[PDB]
Amino acid sequence: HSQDLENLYFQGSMNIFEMLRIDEGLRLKIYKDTEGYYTIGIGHLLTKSPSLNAAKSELDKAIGRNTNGVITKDEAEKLFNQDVDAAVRGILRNAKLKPVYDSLDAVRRAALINMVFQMGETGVAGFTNSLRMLQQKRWDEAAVNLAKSRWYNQTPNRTKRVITTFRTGTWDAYKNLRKKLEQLYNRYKDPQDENKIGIDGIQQFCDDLALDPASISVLIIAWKFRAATQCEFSKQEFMDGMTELGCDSIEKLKAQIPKMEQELKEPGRFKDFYQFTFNFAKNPGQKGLDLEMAIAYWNLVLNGRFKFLDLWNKFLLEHHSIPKDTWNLLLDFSTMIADDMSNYDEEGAWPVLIDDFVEFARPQIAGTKS
Ligand SMILES: Cc1ccc([C@H]2c3c(C)nn(-c4ccccc4)c3NC(=O)[C@H]2NC(=O)c2cccc(C)c2)cc1
């Protein structure tokens, strides 16, 4: 098959795909990008359709099998390589980019393609003076000039690596990044399971970030790392998260935490975080969340947000598992409910648990009015 990666085995193992895996990151399951559009792989837009089945249909045509929204890294590379071919075709019919592209060695061409993936042809073509420097092989001067750009300010760590690639014509920046992340991961990894960071590594991670392990900030990090389950941090999660956060160091991750916290001031992002917490907290082997665990995470994530949290605890501690829908709807309840619960709609198909809670809160609500 034309797309078989075996056709690239004559190349180096470092390539544009591995470069963008580092710089942009790789998603092997369909997800919604920034504009809400179904995407997979390295930034491969599947469709602007709101229909996930439409996205899966586009993915199956592109991959050539029934994927059900999940692909392998190799399949993602094949998708990416098609996108690279298209980007190269575009470069080559761009009067402003073709001269420099033709002039560049293969590694520096990858750096230019990286730029085109990030900012598009018109964006890259705006770098007239730096592109001339590159075309003249004035590498250090190009590097200096590119670093003065807004590009650098937007994505300093990626941009630094791309610039280094222009400067050196080598993959050093990517080798160095990979090694940095490997060596940081190795600081935290479970001595008995190379594939995860365990409790002790998470403790060390928190210590290195000067975070109380029981703080919401730690759960916020897990959320940004799309961690699957509490008390584990898989190698994939760690690497993917550091990539997506643009961090290759603990200092950089530390500087990112307030930005993740700031993201939560958006109710839509807080809802995402809130819903994330359910699957994260739940035992993988279980379909629902143990009430005791639910209470613990509710108190972490809803304290200060859910005005009846204290009554909710009292209610639940008198109760003798929580399904995802009930977890989710508690936030909806929290958002709509009047300070005295007078606007509860019993016919709103709330969980029975919430119906019962509204009934339970009656003595307290009556006492307060008294
Ligand atoms: C040292 C350490 C701190 C926190 C935890 C969990 C945990 C546990 C076991 N109770 N727990 C909690 C529950 C309610 C209130 C307060 C804390 C939490 N709060 C979460 O962030 C938990 N976070 C993770 O596992 C986890 C996974 C992947 C990446 C990252 C960065 C974290 C375990 C170990």
Swiss-Prot record:
The DCUN1 domain, also known as PONY domain, mediates the interaction with different cullins. The DCUN1 domain mediates the interaction with the N-terminally acetylated NEDD8-conjugating E2s enzyme leading to the NEDD8 transfer from N-terminally acetylated NEDD8-conjugating E2s enzyme to different cullin C-terminal domain-RBX complexes; the neddylation efficiency correlates with the DCUN1D1-cullin and DCUN1D1-E2 interaction affinities. The UBA-like domain mediates interaction with autoubiquitylated ARIH2 leading to ubiquitin ligation to DCUN1D1. Expressed in pancreas, kidney, placenta, brain and heart. Weakly or not expressed in liver, skeletal muscle and lung. Strongly overexpressed in thyroid tumors, bronchioloalveolar carcinomas, and malignant tissues of squamous cell carcinoma of the oral tongue. Not overexpressed in aggressive adrenocortical carcinomas. It comes from Homo sapiens (Human). Mono- and poly-ubiquitinated by ARIH2 and ARIH1. Monoubiquitination by ARIH2 is mediated by an interaction between autoubiquitinated ARIH2 and the UBA-like domain. The monoubiquitinated form preferentially interacts with non-neddylated cullins and modulates cullin RING ligase (CRL) complex composition and activity. Part of an E3 complex for neddylation composed of cullins, RBX1, UBE2M and CAND1. Interacts (via the DCUN1 domain) with the unneddylated cullins: interacts with CUL1, CUL2, CUL3, CUL4A, CUL4B and CUL5; these interactions promote the cullin neddylation and the identity of the cullin dictates the affinity of the interaction. Binds neddylated CUL1. Interacts (via the C-terminus 50 AA) directly with RBX1. Interacts (via DCUN1 domain) with the N-terminally acetylated form of UBE2M and UBE2F. Interacts preferentially with UBE2M-NEDD8 thioester (via N-terminus 1-26 AA) than with free UBE2M. Changing C231 to A/G/I/L/T/V: Loss of ability to stimulate cullin neddylation. Keywords: Acetylation, Cytoplasm, Nucleus, Proto-oncogene, Ubl conjugation, Ubl conjugation pathway. This is DCN1-like protein 1. GO terms for molecular function: cullin family protein binding; ubiquitin conjugating enzyme binding; ubiquitin-like protein binding. The gene is DCUN1D1. The record marks C231 as: Essential for interaction with UBE2M. One of its GO terms (cellular component) is nucleus. It comes from the Eukaryota. GO terms for biological process: positive regulation of protein neddylation; protein neddylation; regulation of protein neddylation; regulation of protein ubiquitination. It is found in: Nucleus; Cytoplasm. The chain holds residues 62 to 256 of 259 of the full protein. Its main location: nucleus. Part of an E3 ubiquitin ligase complex for neddylation. Promotes neddylation of cullin components of E3 cullin-RING ubiquitin ligase complexes. Acts by binding to cullin-RBX1 complexes in the cytoplasm and promoting their nuclear translocation, enhancing recruitment of E2-NEDD8 (UBE2M-NEDD8) thioester to the complex, and optimizing the orientation of proteins in the complex to allow efficient transfer of NEDD8 from the E2 to the cullin substrates. Involved in the release of inhibitory effets of CAND1 on cullin-RING ligase E3 complex assembly and activity. Residues 178-362 form the DCUN1 domain.
